[PDB]
Design an enzyme around this catalytic site. Structure first.
Site, mmCIF file in Angstrom:
data_model
loop_
_atom_site.group_PDB
_atom_site.id
_atom_site.type_symbol
_atom_site.label_atom_id
_atom_site.label_comp_id
_atom_site.label_asym_id
_atom_site.label_seq_id
_atom_site.Cartn_x
_atom_site.Cartn_y
_atom_site.Cartn_z
ATOM 1 N N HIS A 70 0.841 -1.290 -0.067
ATOM 2 C CA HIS A 70 -0.016 0.088 -0.085
ATOM 3 C C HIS A 70 0.863 1.128 0.061
ATOM 4 O O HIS A 70 0.370 2.462 -0.355
ATOM 5 C CB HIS A 70 -1.081 -0.047 1.138
ATOM 6 C CG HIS A 70 -0.789 0.556 2.425
ATOM 7 N ND1 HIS A 70 -0.061 -0.549 3.527
ATOM 8 C CD2 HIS A 70 -0.497 1.723 2.895
ATOM 9 C CE1 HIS A 70 0.090 0.408 4.531
ATOM 10 N NE2 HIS A 70 0.171 1.600 4.212
ATOM 11 N N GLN A 110 0.043 6.323 11.205
ATOM 12 C CA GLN A 110 0.113 6.942 9.751
ATOM 13 C C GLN A 110 1.749 7.444 9.494
ATOM 14 O O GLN A 110 2.113 8.220 10.205
ATOM 15 C CB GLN A 110 -0.892 7.846 9.256
ATOM 16 C CG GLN A 110 -2.431 7.265 8.942
ATOM 17 C CD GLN A 110 -2.755 6.330 9.988
ATOM 18 O OE1 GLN A 110 -3.011 6.628 10.968
ATOM 19 N NE2 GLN A 110 -2.515 4.916 9.665
ATOM 20 N N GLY A 111 2.299 6.994 8.663
ATOM 21 C CA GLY A 111 3.405 7.328 8.030
ATOM 22 C C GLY A 111 4.524 6.374 8.623
ATOM 23 O O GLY A 111 5.469 6.241 8.255
ATOM 24 N N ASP A 112 4.243 5.228 9.256
ATOM 25 C CA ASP A 112 4.995 4.186 9.877
ATOM 26 C C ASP A 112 4.826 2.930 8.762
ATOM 27 O O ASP A 112 5.642 2.220 8.796
ATOM 28 C CB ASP A 112 4.631 3.838 11.032
ATOM 29 C CG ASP A 112 5.123 4.875 12.282
ATOM 30 O OD1 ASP A 112 6.222 5.459 12.144
ATOM 31 O OD2 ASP A 112 4.238 4.908 13.196
ATOM 32 N N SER A 113 3.604 3.105 8.039
ATOM 33 C CA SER A 113 3.430 1.929 7.306
ATOM 34 C C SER A 113 4.982 1.248 6.427
ATOM 35 O O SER A 113 5.631 2.229 5.857
ATOM 36 C CB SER A 113 2.294 2.090 6.114
ATOM 37 O OG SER A 113 1.161 2.341 6.743
ATOM 38 N N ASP A 153 0.348 -7.499 2.120
ATOM 39 C CA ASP A 153 0.680 -6.090 1.896
ATOM 40 C C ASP A 153 2.447 -6.014 2.035
ATOM 41 O O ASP A 153 2.877 -5.273 2.946
ATOM 42 C CB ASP A 153 0.081 -5.333 3.011
ATOM 43 C CG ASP A 153 0.217 -3.794 2.811
ATOM 44 O OD1 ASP A 153 0.489 -3.386 1.900
ATOM 45 O OD2 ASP A 153 -0.443 -3.151 3.850
#
Length: 224
Positions: free
Chosen positions: A41, A177-180, A84
């Site tokens: 993603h 969010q932003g760690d993915s 993912d």
């Protein structure tokens, strides 16, 4: 990273920050000199040109070595939140040495054990919905959540064996969010997962959900 602490130099020699459109976006794991493991993603369907990798720095803005992308291989059966994972090839090789090193992958067939201690790192939000993003890397330690428990939280359908879960039942420690795409490691610093998804961040009763390295070694070992 929610409920975390500042990472020290050398803590994750293989971690990379992935910017998009010059802005923070995701993290990743350096597999070798020309190869980064991230979340599908993070990269799926987006202009490849947008992406930059940075290695060998606690900062996502400064220091270390940078690379653009030569290619993106998303897991063939990446599907919704499932499988993912994506392999990135780098135009600039990133040699090991210094605070740069390559990830040790979890054994094929392995699944993280409920209750065991995992450490997740990144440059994402420090709370759900937060607009600050750290410049310097943060980390947090959380227990593995039983898949059964995660199924209770999310539904059976939502959680496959290509995912595992980690977090604290009373909330307050998680990736966000932003760690993915970034690394989750075991107590030995073995790469067990990539930050994938969750219902918000650090919510009591909604675990962080990770893409499982042990389940997806076939994909990884092929293209690495």
């Amino acid at each position: 990273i929610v409920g975390g602490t500042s990472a020290s130099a050398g803590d994750f020699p293989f971690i990379v920050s992935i910017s998009r459109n010059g802005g923070p976006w995701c993290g990743g794991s350096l597999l070798n000199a020309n190869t980064v493991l991230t979340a599908a993603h993070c990269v799926s369907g987006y202009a490849q040109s947008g992406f930059q990798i940075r290695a060998g720095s606690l900062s996502r803005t400064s220091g270390g070595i940078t690379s653009s992308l030569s290619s993106v291989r998303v897991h063939p059966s990446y599907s919704g939140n499932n499988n993912d994972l994506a392999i990135l090839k780098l135009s600039t090789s990133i040699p090991s040495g210094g605070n740069i090193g390559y990830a040790r992958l979890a054994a094929s067939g392995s699944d993280p054990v409920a209750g065991s201690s995992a450490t997740v790192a990144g440059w994402g939000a420090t709370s759900e919905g937060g607009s600050s993003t750290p410049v310097n890397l943060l980390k947090v330690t959380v227990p593995i959540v039983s898949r059964a428990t995660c199924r209770a939280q999310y539904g059976t359908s939502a959680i496959t064996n290509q995912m595992f879960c980690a977090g604290v039942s009373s909330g307050g420690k998680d990736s966000c969010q932003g760690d993915s795409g970034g690394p989750i490691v075991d107590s030995s610093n073995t790469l067990i997962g990539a930050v994938s998804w969750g219902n918000g961040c650090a919510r009591p009763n909604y675990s962080g959900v990770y893409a499982s390295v042990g389940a997806l070694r076939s994909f990884i070992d092929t293209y690495a």
